[PDB]
Amino acid sequence: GELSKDGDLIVSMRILGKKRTKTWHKGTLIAIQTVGPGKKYKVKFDNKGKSLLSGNHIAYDYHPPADKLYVGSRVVAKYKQVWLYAGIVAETPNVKNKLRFLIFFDDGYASYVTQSELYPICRPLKKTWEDIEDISCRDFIEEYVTAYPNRPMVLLKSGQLIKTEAEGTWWKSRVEEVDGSLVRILFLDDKRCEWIYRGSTRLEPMFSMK
Amino acid sequence: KSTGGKAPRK
């Protein structure tokens, strides 16, 4: 069941492939084979190694034309060390976010990225969250994508003090910066910062609103 | 990595 092509996936093309580290790397598509219920894509990485990957574990080595992607799109994006990591498009370019894509990564991390920092996954699952390993992440994305565009958020201002959840504990914290749908939270006991989605119930006011 | 994810732990 060997193939030279599969629609726009052609043997010899440049490609990104997911390694066991969960990070994504440049390589070449060297074979396509039907194994059991679907296709496997054999990738030879530029730096080191080969892998046989499912079509949701390869990505195109080009950036999307902006309006190709939408909320729920499965992508690889620059995670700012710096790595390429898998995620979901949570918000597309607009004036409020300065024309950036909001990415919710597979591990729960969130950040805004530019059009030249993301790569569409070749064959995502129809329900795009179903290949997210971490179950709390998987569930969150299903809920978020399905509820879109209904996004309850809290209005927060720089200098405002709130409790923010992390690791089972609610911590004294401070709002350092607002950036579109993200808020930069300073945890006051240990002095670390985290960018958090303004609709996340890890923010006390958002938790308390529901 | 240091992420706390999108929802409280669980």
The DSSP element (H or E) to which A204 belongs, if any, is: helix A204-209
Q: Output the CA angle A85-A74-A68, nearest 5 degrees.
A: 120
Residue at A81: amino acid letter: Q
Picking from A42, A59, A76, the residue at the C-terminal end of a domain is A59
Residues of A in Cβ contact (< 8 Å) with B8: 165, 168, 201-202, 207
Number of other residues whose CB lies within 10 A of the CB of residue A87 = 27
Way the structure was solved:
X-ray
Picking from A33, A59, A85, the residue at the C-terminal end of a domain is A59
Same domain, A183 and A106: no
Phi, psi (rounded to 5 degrees) for A143: -60, -50
Phi, psi (rounded to 5 degrees) for A14: -70, 145
Which of A136, A144, A192 is the closest to B5 by Cβ?
A: A136
Q: Which residues on adjacent β-strands are paired with residue A195?
A: A184
Residue at A119: amino acid letter: Y
CA distances from A100 to A58, A97, A149, A181, A184 (A): 23, 6, 17, 11, 17
Which residue range is the domain that position A113 belongs to? 60-151
Number of other residues whose CB lies within 10 A of the CB of residue A191 = 7
Number of other residues whose CB lies within 10 A of the CB of residue A149 = 6
How many contacts does A have with B, using Cβ atoms within 8 A?
46
Same domain, A114 and A186: no
Picking from A109, A136, A151, the residue at the C-terminal end of a domain is A151
CA distances from A18 to A60, A67, A85, A105, A133 (A): 12, 25, 8, 14, 14
Exposure of A17 by Cβ count < 10 A (0-12 exposed, 13-18 middle, 19+ buried)?
A: buried
Tell me whether residues A202 and B6 touch, CB distance under 8 A.
yes
Same domain, A114 and A137: yes
- The helix/strand/coil state of A83 is strand
We report the CATH number of the domain holding residue A206 as 2.30.30.140
Tell me whether residues A202 and B3 touch, CB distance under 8 A.
no
Same domain, A83 and A103: yes
Same domain, A64 and A49: no
What's the length of chain A? 210
Phi, psi (rounded to 5 degrees) for B8: -60, 145
Exposure of A18 by Cβ count < 10 A (0-12 exposed, 13-18 middle, 19+ buried)?
A: buried
How many angstroms separate the CA atoms of A203 and A70, rounded? 26
Residues of B in Cβ contact (< 8 Å) with A104: 6
Say which residues have a Cβ less than 8 Å from residue A178's Cβ, sequence separation at least 6. A156, A157, A158, A184, A198
CA distances from A105 to A74, A80, A172, B5 (A): 10, 12, 26, 9
Residue at A181: amino acid letter: S
Same domain, A46 and A65: no
